[PDB]
């Protein structure tokens, strides 16, 4: 599975 | 504005470790609401509203 980041996660 | 996706089958085992994200097993069907943005869509599940990875989910 891809990594991961949530460094780039927008607001809900 | 909403990006180009409607629905989406998940790929991987996605956990949700915050409040925003929307958790998954693989093989899920995915309503998703918003995929506008490239790294992290918006989506539907179980009634839920949540975040998830965009690269573990297939349109």
Known sequence: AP???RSTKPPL | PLGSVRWARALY???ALEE????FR???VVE?????????????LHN???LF???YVAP
């Open chain 2, 26 to 28: 693989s093989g899920e």
């Open chain 2, 48 to 50: 839920k509203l949540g």
């Open chain 2, 53 to 55: 990875p965009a690269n």
């Open chain 1, 3 to 5: 990594s991961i980041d």
């Open chain 2, 13 to 15: 085992d996605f956990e």
């Open chain 2, 20 to 23: 925003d994200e929307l958790g």
């Open chain 2, 32 to 44: 998703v609401l918003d995929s506008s943005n490239p790294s992290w869509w918006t989506g539907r």
